[PDB]
């Protein structure tokens, strides 16, 4: 199960806001948080607005939690399962597609990474193949750089830790964007989580 936390706050106890992206969540029943296997039990759920007890994917959640460190909680952690949860980063290869630049990128370029709620600083280490728009054909040798409007697969380091999943797996935890300044300099899609 998956809940990307957008907001944090101490109101009537600890509270968290997000969208329930996967797996139904029951009133009270344990969760565990990311990327810190951090224990936590539900105290109350407000889907859309009113309260619910059971709440399934799609609903806008506002949960009162009960846990170990309760403002030590950052916008960008999923709520996951006890139990079979949720892989996490810092390293991955991914298909990128270099929209409003419009200058260059070569390896060692930096930018900000929007994936789910996470919004971490990040750098592209090296760039692998430059994927053509012809027949989806991958490249052959690594380019030094990647121009605007181009496409490629590249390796990326998060500052610290992301809670990550591959697009080709759970894509809500996948489709990401390299935002630099204002301009959304590029569009990313996570392929290979290393390791």
């Amino acid at each position: 199960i998956r809940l990307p936390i957008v907001d944090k706050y101490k109101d009537m106890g600890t509270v968290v806001l997000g969208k329930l992206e996967s797996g139904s969540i029951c009133k009270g029943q344990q969760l565990v948080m990311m990327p810190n296997k951090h224990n936590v039990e539900v105290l109350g759920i407000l889907s859309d607005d009113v309260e619910t007890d059971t709440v399934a994917p799609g609903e806008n959640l506002k949960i009162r939690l009960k846990g170990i460190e309760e403002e030590e909680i950052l916008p960008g952690f999923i709520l996951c399962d006890p139990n079979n949860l949720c892989h996490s980063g810092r390293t991955f290869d991914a298909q990128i597609v270099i929209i409003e630049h419009k200058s260059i990128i070569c390896p060692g370029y930096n930018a900000v990474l929007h994936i789910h709620t996470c919004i971490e600083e990040v750098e592209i280490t090296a760039l692998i193949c430059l994927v053509d728009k012809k027949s989806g054909e991958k490249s052959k040798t690594r380019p030094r750089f990647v121009k605007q409007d181009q496409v490629c697969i590249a390796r990326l380091r998060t500052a610290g830790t992301i809670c990550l999943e591959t697009f080709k797996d759970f894509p809500q935890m996948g489709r990401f964007t390299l935002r630099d300044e204002g301009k959304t300099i590029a569009i990313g899609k996570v392929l290979k989580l290393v390791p």
Binding site: K102, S103, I104, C106, P107, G108, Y109, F145, K147
Partner: protein, 380 residues
């Protein structure tokens, strides 16, 4: 100016690659002859020195000290008068890999006017003094705003100077059965206002002199709201508003919070040197952003391209695997070669770090050596 940038690289290099030298017994003389001094004199004191290390009573030590005193005097004869800026010499012999040696003999002028005297033989050379030739620094300004008092000053290289400061008395003293909280603001809310006015006033007086700014920095430091109050004022603008490099929230103020405004500021100033380096990769990158592209990269392309119709700007990164066929750790520093005759190949060269987001990339992703060529370039 670009020919002295190189100078500093040249010195920087030496300076470090002399720490890497460390030979045995006392056979490592450092000599720094300040200008306006007189060789024959120095060289005389070296006979006075040969004269006493003529005993030494340590065989292997002795034969070496002498051999290094000659070694220096010998190089001192290639000068008949102390060069306008001073003479720097370094003589000895140093152990390396495998246990081979290397009679090391350095003697140059100085990209400046060296000033200081020093004759010393440790088992290493002494460049603690050559590093003063690298403080080639800009003058920075500081405004330090405070609940009462403001203080203007500069920090240039290593000289903090206090320039001007006045202290105010914003009727902070209250009443007990007569004054108004209307009295607070009325006169307080304009004092504070009328006060930032004199700050911006004495800022424009002290930093922009004659059409333009005579600093190059401006760090603003102040108690709550005093810089977002000065920064954002219809009375403090012009160049200054666009010259501020860092802010500092301080609880202090005056010479107290002016020191703190430096300790806290160090971080960003160390960037000016960085700027013109970021500026100069920009043009390079932004050839390759383009179809036209008088750009080159690697060893191969850069070399012959430098060899013929010049490249206007040659960009190499301070450190470099490559040597002079051009081998790295695969078995003269190539950059060093560029330094000692880049000028005859088609004008200036710019040496750049791997410490800015472009530096990072130039070295990370191009080879740390390339050029913004002068015209078209027919590839293989």
């Amino acid at each position: 100016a670009a020919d002295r940038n190189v100078e500093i690289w040249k010195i920087k290099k030496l300076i470090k690659s002399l720490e890497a030298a460390r030979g045995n017994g006392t056979s490592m003389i450092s000599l720094i002859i300040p200008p306006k001094d007189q060789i024959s004199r120095v060289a005389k004191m070296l006979a006075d020195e040969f004269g006493t290390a003529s005993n030494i009573k340590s065989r292997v030590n002795r034969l070496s000290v002498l051999g290094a005193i000659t070694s220096v005097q010998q190089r001192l004869k290639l000068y008949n008068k102390v060069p306008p800026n001073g003479l720097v010499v370094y003589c000895g012999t140093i152990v390396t890999e495998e246990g081979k040696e290397k009679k090391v003999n350095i003697d140059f002028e100085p990209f400046k006017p060296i000033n200081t005297s020093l004759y010393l033989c440790d088992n290493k050379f002494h460049t603690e003094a050559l590093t003063a030739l690298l403080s080639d620094d800009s003058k920075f300004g500081f405004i330090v705003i405070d609940g009462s008092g403001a203080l203007f000053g500069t920090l240039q290289g290593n000289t903090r100077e206090v320039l001007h400061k006045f202290t105010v008395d914003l009727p902070k003293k209250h009443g007990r059965g007569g004054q108004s909280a209307l009295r607070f603001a009325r006169l307080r809310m304009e004092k504070r206002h009328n006060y930032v006015r004199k700050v911006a006033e004495t800022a424009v007086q002290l930093f922009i002199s004659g059409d333009k700014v005579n600093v190059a920095g401006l760090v603003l430091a102040g108690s709550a709201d005093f810089k977002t109050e000065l920064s954002q004022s219809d009375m403090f603008d012009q160049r200054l508003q666009s010259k501020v490099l860092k802010l500092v929230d301080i609880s202090y103020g005056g010479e107290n919070g002016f020191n703190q405004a430096i300790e806290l500021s160090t971080e960003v100033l160390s960037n000016v040197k960085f700027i013109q380096e970021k500026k100069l990769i920009g043009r390079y990158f932004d050839e390759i952003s383009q179809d036209t592209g008088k750009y080159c990269f690697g060893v191969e392309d850069t070399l012959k391209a430098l060899e013929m119709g010049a490249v206007e700007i040659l960009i190499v990164y301070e450190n470099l695997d490559i040597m002079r066929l051009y081998l790295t750790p695969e078995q003269m520093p190539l950059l060093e070669w560029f330094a000692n005759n880049y000028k005859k190949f088609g004008a200036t060269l710019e040496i750049v770090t791997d410490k800015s987001q472009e530096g990072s990339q130039f070295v990370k992703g191009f080879g740390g050596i390339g050029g913004i060529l002068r015209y078209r370039v027919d590839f293989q």
